[PDB]
Design a protein around this nucleic acid. Structure first.
Ligand SMILES: [Cu+]
Ligand SMILES: [Cu+]
Ligand SMILES: [K+]
Ligand SMILES: [K+]
Ligand SMILES: [K+]
Ligand SMILES: [K+]
Ligand SMILES: [K+]
Ligand SMILES: [K+]
Ligand SMILES: [K+]
Ligand SMILES: [K+]
Ligand SMILES: [K+]
Ligand SMILES: [K+]
Ligand SMILES: [K+]
Ligand SMILES: [K+]
Ligand SMILES: [K+]
Ligand SMILES: [K+]
Ligand SMILES: [K+]
Ligand SMILES: [K+]
Ligand SMILES: [K+]
Ligand SMILES: [K+]
Ligand SMILES: [K+]
Ligand SMILES: [K+]
Ligand SMILES: [K+]
Ligand SMILES: [K+]
Ligand SMILES: [K+]
Ligand SMILES: [K+]
Ligand SMILES: [K+]
Ligand SMILES: [K+]
Ligand SMILES: [K+]
Ligand SMILES: [K+]
Ligand SMILES: [K+]
Ligand SMILES: [K+]
Ligand SMILES: [K+]
Ligand SMILES: [K+]
Ligand SMILES: [K+]
Ligand SMILES: [K+]
Ligand SMILES: [K+]
Ligand SMILES: [K+]
Ligand SMILES: [K+]
Ligand SMILES: [K+]
Ligand SMILES: [K+]
Ligand SMILES: [K+]
Ligand SMILES: [K+]
Ligand SMILES: [K+]
Ligand SMILES: [K+]
Ligand SMILES: [K+]
Ligand SMILES: [K+]
Ligand SMILES: [K+]
Ligand SMILES: [K+]
Ligand SMILES: [K+]
Ligand SMILES: [K+]
Ligand SMILES: [Mg+2]
Ligand SMILES: [Mg+2]
Ligand SMILES: [Mg+2]
Ligand SMILES: [Mg+2]
Ligand SMILES: [Mg+2]
Ligand SMILES: [Mg+2]
Ligand SMILES: [Mg+2]
Ligand SMILES: [Mg+2]
Ligand SMILES: [Mg+2]
Ligand SMILES: [Mg+2]
Ligand SMILES: [Mg+2]
Ligand SMILES: [Mg+2]
Ligand SMILES: [Mg+2]
Ligand SMILES: [Mg+2]
Ligand SMILES: [Mg+2]
Ligand SMILES: [Mg+2]
Ligand SMILES: [Mg+2]
Ligand SMILES: [Mg+2]
Ligand SMILES: [Mg+2]
Ligand SMILES: [Mg+2]
Ligand SMILES: [Mg+2]
Ligand SMILES: [Mg+2]
Ligand SMILES: [Mg+2]
Ligand SMILES: [Mg+2]
Ligand SMILES: [Mg+2]
Ligand SMILES: [Mg+2]
Ligand SMILES: [Mg+2]
Ligand SMILES: [Mg+2]
Ligand SMILES: [Mg+2]
Ligand SMILES: [Mg+2]
Ligand SMILES: [Mg+2]
Ligand SMILES: [Mg+2]
Ligand SMILES: [Mg+2]
Ligand SMILES: [Mg+2]
Ligand SMILES: [Mg+2]
Ligand SMILES: [Mg+2]
Ligand SMILES: [Mg+2]
Ligand SMILES: [Mg+2]
Ligand SMILES: [Mg+2]
Ligand SMILES: [Mg+2]
Ligand SMILES: [Mg+2]
Ligand SMILES: [Mg+2]
Ligand SMILES: [Mg+2]
Ligand SMILES: [Mg+2]
Ligand SMILES: [Mg+2]
Ligand SMILES: [Mg+2]
Ligand SMILES: [Mg+2]
Ligand SMILES: [Mg+2]
Ligand SMILES: [Mg+2]
Ligand SMILES: [Mg+2]
Ligand SMILES: [Mg+2]
Ligand SMILES: [Mg+2]
Ligand SMILES: [Mg+2]
Ligand SMILES: [Mg+2]
Ligand SMILES: [Mg+2]
Ligand SMILES: [Mg+2]
Ligand SMILES: [Mg+2]
Ligand SMILES: [Mg+2]
Ligand SMILES: [Mg+2]
Ligand SMILES: [Mg+2]
Ligand SMILES: [Mg+2]
Ligand SMILES: [Mg+2]
Ligand SMILES: [Mg+2]
Ligand SMILES: [Mg+2]
Ligand SMILES: [Mg+2]
Ligand SMILES: [Mg+2]
Ligand SMILES: [Mg+2]
Ligand SMILES: [Mg+2]
Ligand SMILES: [Mg+2]
Ligand SMILES: [Mg+2]
Ligand SMILES: [Mg+2]
Ligand SMILES: [Mg+2]
Ligand SMILES: [Mg+2]
Ligand SMILES: [Mg+2]
Ligand SMILES: [Mg+2]
Ligand SMILES: [Mg+2]
Ligand SMILES: [Mg+2]
Ligand SMILES: [Mg+2]
Ligand SMILES: [Mg+2]
Ligand SMILES: [Mg+2]
Ligand SMILES: [Mg+2]
Ligand SMILES: [Mg+2]
Ligand SMILES: [Mg+2]
Ligand SMILES: [Mg+2]
Ligand SMILES: [Mg+2]
Ligand SMILES: [Mg+2]
Ligand SMILES: [Mg+2]
Ligand SMILES: [Mg+2]
Lengths: 78, 64, 52, 96
RNA sequence: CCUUUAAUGUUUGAUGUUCUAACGUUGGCCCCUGAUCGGGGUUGCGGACAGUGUCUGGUGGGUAGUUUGACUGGGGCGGUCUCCUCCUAAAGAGUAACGGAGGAGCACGAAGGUUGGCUAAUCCUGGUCGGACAUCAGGAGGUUAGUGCAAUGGCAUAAGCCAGCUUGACUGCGAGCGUGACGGCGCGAGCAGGUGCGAAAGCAGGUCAUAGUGAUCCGGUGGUUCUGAAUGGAAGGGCCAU
RNA sequence: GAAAUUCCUUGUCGGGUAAGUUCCGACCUGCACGAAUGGCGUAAUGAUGGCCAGGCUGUCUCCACCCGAGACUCAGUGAAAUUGAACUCGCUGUGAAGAUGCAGUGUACCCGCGGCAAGACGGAAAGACCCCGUGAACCUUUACUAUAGCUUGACACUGAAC
RNA sequence: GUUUAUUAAAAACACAGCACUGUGCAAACACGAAAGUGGACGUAUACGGUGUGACGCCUGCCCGGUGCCGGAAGGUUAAUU
RNA sequence: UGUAACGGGGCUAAACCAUGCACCGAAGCUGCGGCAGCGACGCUUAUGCGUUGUUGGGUAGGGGAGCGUUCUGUAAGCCUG
RNA sequence: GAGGACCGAACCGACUAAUGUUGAAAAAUUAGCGGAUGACUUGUGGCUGGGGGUGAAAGGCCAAUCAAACCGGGAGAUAGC
RNA sequence: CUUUUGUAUAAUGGGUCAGCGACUUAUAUUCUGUAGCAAGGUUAACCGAAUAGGGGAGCCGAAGGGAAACCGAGUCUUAA
RNA sequence: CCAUAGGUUAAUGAGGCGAACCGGGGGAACUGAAACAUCUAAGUACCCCGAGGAAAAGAAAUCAACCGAGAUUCCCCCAGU
């Protein structure tokens, strides 16, 4: 006999690229994600594939804010 | 006898001032409607040959 | 793959064209859009034509 | 260039450009070359006589490279802006 | 001298008949000649046919040169081969098996941009036809709905639903970054030009995101302040779009 | 017609035998006979295939004796394959997984000669099976690409008249 | 009768007989760039090719496929022009 | 195939548990002597010397430094009846 | 006095068995076996040549060689083994 | 010895000795060392009786960018 | 019938051999392309004809580029352009 399985897709290398406290340059990707598990905070942008990236030089900061206890990433100016 | 150039490589690489090679990007010959303008625009300028490929290019082009 | 390629030709006479696709069975009417012509550097009307 | 059978680099990239016959008969002249000719007049013939340009060169351009410290007359060549400034400052002249 | 229409000296076309002089003769006779070869002569038969050369369509295992994939708990047979989603995967990334499960090879000038507005499923009760389920009203409920199509991650400030105006599904670029052995692929503020929506702050370089794909060569089409084998052109080539 | 064909199958029935997967005669349920890549018969023929019987016998029960030629001893002549090196035992275990050579243990004074082949994965031939190599050959064909031959027409050699 | 000289002698090959088919003679056919030669100093009661295989009784149905044979009104189609 | 499921002998501990102190045991560590690689610190006749720390198992393979053989020059020299 | 008639030596074969298998022999010996006036057998000489011959057909045979002889050459073919 | 994940292996090769038996040669190219000269370096064929000397035809280097025309310490891109 | 073909005689020449080099008529495949057909190997190997001490080629219906060169042959560059 044979199997009807045997397929998969290539790994997409998502996840956090710069962790809390890391110094980054403007433009740096901070996290790659499907949809907004993390949300964009101060000095952070959200791209068309929901990548969060730095809009200014500084240090990465994660926090939980708002009425829904959501996770936000911001850049602290250094 | 004299080493023979690989003529096909000579048609696709040119040596630059510090000794690298410039080349034309792939993917801009046809099937163009379905590609974004940003992608095509970034394929238009010539690029440099990568470090892992420099050896193959140099082997093909002894008189470059 | 029923959608067919088409070109949108500038009305400014520059020869500039964009390309796109169209479902010709459901929308037989010609596509017409204002788009930027980089030759004359203005937005003008562009009209559907055959792809070539 | 063989890579094990994968389309090799020199064939997965595209060809580009054309080769210009006029480039093969055009040469560049340095400022330091100007004093090397015989007689103080720089033209195609005197450069060829001094072995500065090849026998089949039909067009030459003087560029700002090296220095000129003597008055020279340049005749029938193209001169860059910087080279023209250097030649005139050294006391020469450029004739079309 | 223009529309049209009859005929021949007259040019080649196809058919048919006749002719002889090219050409055939493995019919008779004569000579070279002591010769069933050959040649010449003569006569009969055939005759512009046949046959051969060059070109050309068909047929052509008669003959030739070759091809006839890989993975694989041996090979064959069967199944598979690129792309996307989950799990295996050991809480960063990555991670194998002919391991466990599903999808793609598109769709859309609106299903895209923007401004303004809105909020689901399901059930209960009352109500003409009307019923288990149509539309109406109220209540409960709180996303159990929805998302153009798998699955996962998302989504109320909605990314879900409705409407007005529209073409940013713009052109040139791009700090910086991600991901690849490489070819490549991806995210991206911001700058110049021109544009749509909004009073405005602003948003817009396609679509909730992640599949919807094919290098190079060879050529085709349009454009072009490039090239142009003596020179001016042209052919061909380059560059840009396709 | 269960066959030079029948898988199931030693089909089933009859015959022959004490007993018959073969044989002979039938049945037909012909996996998958069949009419000139002939069907069904057929006297004669066959170093042809199968089966039965009489005769015959050392084929056998079950071997015995004998006659010769070797084998064995003496004299003369004088090979071979093979061979890393050998001071070249058994057993149980171990271990590239079936040991003369390791471990433990048992047995064993040194050396010939006639015999036998259980082992030295004994000798012989770079496995012929199987797989692999982008190896070979020769064969096939409605595989691909060609091509001799065969066939078509145009022009030439090739002319006249109606 | 023949055969795998050297592991197969046979039920294989051949065979007389049978049929189909080609061939009008410079025969078809075969060897051969060709000239020629065989076929044959033969001429359809002859010669080649193919299948079957003494003899006896026989040899049924199918021409849709592939081939061969005939047809040539039409469609398509080469060089050439 | 033969004890053949402590390696054997043998063992009632020479078995097992617990506690303790001795000892044996390797190319490990130390002692004594020697050689080499690398690095520091100083001398120096600038390429060796001294002091010091440390290193020195190796297949594919990379790097370094040498032995010997024949032939040419040095050599009509030098050794050799 | 016919006959691919019959029995059977020479002659031509090669069905069975034993032996032999570093042979007496690179295919034989021994005991038996088939044909033996024929499509028989044999001597001498001739002819056919390698994608070619010849083949009562076994891919048989073509000098102890045959699904393409032997010799020389391309030639140190190529060999991811 | 070889080959291997791994061989006392009952995997391979060798009866023994002696002699022979396998990374070369030419040209081109790049890198290292070393020597000469140095913004220069060097000649080829050839001439020459000449390892001299002549011969600088040439080749490499002192400039790049651009498909190219072209511009040039800049240039290309683009209307910028 | 003139003739021609044919026949006889005489004079002169040719033929055959040889290692390479040379001109001409024909002309592979292995191989490489990591398969293979275009292509390559290569106008090579090989077969054939002919010459000479050499052969062949040779006195522009050639190049160049608006300036000029001035038959053929051979060597170094140009340029692995
Ligand atoms: Cu036609
Ligand atoms: Cu003669
Ligand atoms: K006649
Ligand atoms: K004719
Ligand atoms: K033809
Ligand atoms: K054929
Ligand atoms: K497996
Ligand atoms: K297995
Ligand atoms: K995971
Ligand atoms: K919209
Ligand atoms: K809208
Ligand atoms: K990259
Ligand atoms: K063009
Ligand atoms: K020219
Ligand atoms: K052009
Ligand atoms: K039956
Ligand atoms: K049957
Ligand atoms: K029975
Ligand atoms: K038949
Ligand atoms: K019959
Ligand atoms: K028989
Ligand atoms: K019988
Ligand atoms: K032992
Ligand atoms: K034995
Ligand atoms: K293959
Ligand atoms: K063979
Ligand atoms: K027989
Ligand atoms: K036979
Ligand atoms: K007949
Ligand atoms: K009969
Ligand atoms: K009869
Ligand atoms: K039929
Ligand atoms: K038919
Ligand atoms: K027709
Ligand atoms: K030391
Ligand atoms: K001496
Ligand atoms: K005879
Ligand atoms: K044959
Ligand atoms: K022979
Ligand atoms: K052959
Ligand atoms: K070995
Ligand atoms: K091995
Ligand atoms: K092995
Ligand atoms: K073995
Ligand atoms: K070996
Ligand atoms: K070198
Ligand atoms: K050097
Ligand atoms: K510019
Ligand atoms: K070939
Ligand atoms: K190959
Ligand atoms: K092959
Ligand atoms: Mg995944
Ligand atoms: Mg293009
Ligand atoms: Mg010069
Ligand atoms: Mg005659
Ligand atoms: Mg074939
Ligand atoms: Mg071949
Ligand atoms: Mg396979
Ligand atoms: Mg299959
Ligand atoms: Mg993970
Ligand atoms: Mg982990
Ligand atoms: Mg791993
Ligand atoms: Mg792995
Ligand atoms: Mg997998
Ligand atoms: Mg599928
Ligand atoms: Mg809104
Ligand atoms: Mg950058
Ligand atoms: Mg602006
Ligand atoms: Mg406004
Ligand atoms: Mg798009
Ligand atoms: Mg949408
Ligand atoms: Mg979507
Ligand atoms: Mg082509
Ligand atoms: Mg011209
Ligand atoms: Mg011109
Ligand atoms: Mg049976
Ligand atoms: Mg039975
Ligand atoms: Mg019975
Ligand atoms: Mg029966
Ligand atoms: Mg039958
Ligand atoms: Mg049948
Ligand atoms: Mg019939
Ligand atoms: Mg039949
Ligand atoms: Mg039949
Ligand atoms: Mg029969
Ligand atoms: Mg019968
Ligand atoms: Mg017989
Ligand atoms: Mg004796
Ligand atoms: Mg064991
Ligand atoms: Mg054992
Ligand atoms: Mg003995
Ligand atoms: Mg014995
Ligand atoms: Mg053996
Ligand atoms: Mg083997
Ligand atoms: Mg083959
Ligand atoms: Mg015979
Ligand atoms: Mg035999
Ligand atoms: Mg026999
Ligand atoms: Mg005849
Ligand atoms: Mg004839
Ligand atoms: Mg004849
Ligand atoms: Mg038959
Ligand atoms: Mg019909
Ligand atoms: Mg017909
Ligand atoms: Mg026992
Ligand atoms: Mg013990
Ligand atoms: Mg204790
Ligand atoms: Mg010790
Ligand atoms: Mg130690
Ligand atoms: Mg010490
Ligand atoms: Mg150590
Ligand atoms: Mg060591
Ligand atoms: Mg000496
Ligand atoms: Mg008889
Ligand atoms: Mg015989
Ligand atoms: Mg006998
Ligand atoms: Mg008889
Ligand atoms: Mg007899
Ligand atoms: Mg031959
Ligand atoms: Mg056979
Ligand atoms: Mg023989
Ligand atoms: Mg062959
Ligand atoms: Mg060769
Ligand atoms: Mg060889
Ligand atoms: Mg193994
Ligand atoms: Mg061991
Ligand atoms: Mg042993
Ligand atoms: Mg061994
Ligand atoms: Mg081996
Ligand atoms: Mg051995
Ligand atoms: Mg080497
Ligand atoms: Mg330059
Ligand atoms: Mg001669
Ligand atoms: Mg090949
Ligand atoms: Mg060639
Ligand atoms: Mg002579
Ligand atoms: Mg001459
Ligand atoms: Mg001449
Ligand atoms: Mg003139």
């Amino acid at each position: 006999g044979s199997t009807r399985n045997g397929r998969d897709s290539e790994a997409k290398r998502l996840g956090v690229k710069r962790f809390g406290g890391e110094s980054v340059l403007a433009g740096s990707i901070i996290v790659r994600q499907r949809g907004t598990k993390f949300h964009a905070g101060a000095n952070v942008g959200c791209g068309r594939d929901h990548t969060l990236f730095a809009k200014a030089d500084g240090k990465v900061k994660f926090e939980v804010k708002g009425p829904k206890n959501r996770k936000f990433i911001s850049i602290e100016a250094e | 006898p004299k080493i023979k150039t690989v003529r096909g490589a000579a048609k696709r690489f040119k040596k630059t001032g510090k000794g690298g090679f410039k080349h034309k990007h792939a993917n801009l010959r046809h099937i163009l409607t379905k590609k974004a303008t940003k992608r095509k625009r970034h394929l238009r300028p010539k690029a440099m040959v990568s470090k892992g490929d420099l050896g193959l290019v140099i082997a093909c082009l002894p008189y470059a | 793959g029923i959608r067919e390629k088409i070109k949108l030709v500038s009305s400014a006479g520059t020869g500039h064209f964009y390309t796109t696709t169209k479902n010709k069975r459901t929308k037989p009417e010609k596509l017409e859009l204002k788009k930027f012509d980089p030759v004359v550097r203005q937005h003008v009307i562009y009209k559907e034509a055959k792809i070539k | 260039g063989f890579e094990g059978g994968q389309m090799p680099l020199y064939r997965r990239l595209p060809k580009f450009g054309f080769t210009s016959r006029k480039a093969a008969i055009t040469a560049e002249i340095r400022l330091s070359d100007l004093a090397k000719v015989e007689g103080g007049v720089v033209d195609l013939n005197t450069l060829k006589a001094a072995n500065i340009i090849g026998i089949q060169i039909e067009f030459a351009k003087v560029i700002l490279a090296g220095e000129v410290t003597t008055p020279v007359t340049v005749r029938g060549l193209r001169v860059t802006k910087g080279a023209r400034a250097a030649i005139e400052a050294a006391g020469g002249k450029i004739e079309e």
